[PDB]
């Protein structure tokens, strides 16, 4: 009922958060090693590329601007349906020719660990 949660203004970034992350698991702070099980599905059709384990530093010059603009305000523990648009997420310049040049495609953010630098040598 009346539209998506939008992170942008207008639309782009259209984040609906559908499992939030129960109490105690709550949203990082800006310097973490966080954890996502992303999977990319087509917007006329299904699973393009599944690929569920994305280890990434938090704001950081790594992942989509779907990804990035969206991450700082992720509660420990969601279910995410990320409809990007094909400037900010990977489309022209992309993953090809699995993940096609124009059409914002669907991408599902399901936010497994957030953990503090984890030391394994």
Same mark, same amino acid.
């Given at each position: 009922?009346?539209?998506?949660?939008?992170? @942008?203004?207008?639309?782009? @970034?259209?984040?609906?958060? @559908?499992?939030?992350?129960?109490?105690?698991?709550?949203?990082?702070?800006?310097?973490?090693?966080?954890?996502?099980?992303?999977?990319?599905?087509?917007?006329?059709?299904?699973?393009?590329?599944?690929?569920?384990?994305?280890?990434?530093?938090?704001?950081? &010059?790594?992942?989509?601007? %779907?990804?990035?603009?969206?991450?700082? @305000?992720?509660?420990?523990?969601?279910?995410?349906?990320?409809? %990007?648009?094909?400037?900010? &997420?990977?489309?022209?310049?992309?993953?090809?020719?699995?993940?096609?040049?124009?059409? %914002?495609? &669907?991408?599902?953010?399901?936010?497994?660990? %957030?953990?503090?630098?984890?030391?394994?040598?």
């Amino acid at each position: 009922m009346r539209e998506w949660l939008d992170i @942008l203004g207008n639309g782009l @970034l259209r984040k609906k958060t @559908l499992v939030p992350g129960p109490p105690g698991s709550s949203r990082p702070v800006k310097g973490q090693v966080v954890t996502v099980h992303l999977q990319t599905s087509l917007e006329n059709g299904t699973r393009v590329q599944e690929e569920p384990e994305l280890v990434f530093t938090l704001g950081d &010059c790594d992942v989509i601007q %779907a990804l990035d603009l969206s991450v700082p @305000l992720m509660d420990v523990g969601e279910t995410a349906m990320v409809t %990007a648009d094909s400037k900010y &997420c990977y489309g022209p310049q992309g993953r090809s020719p699995y993940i096609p040049p124009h059409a %914002a495609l &669907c991408l599902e953010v399901t936010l497994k660990t %957030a953990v503090d630098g984890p030391d394994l040598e």
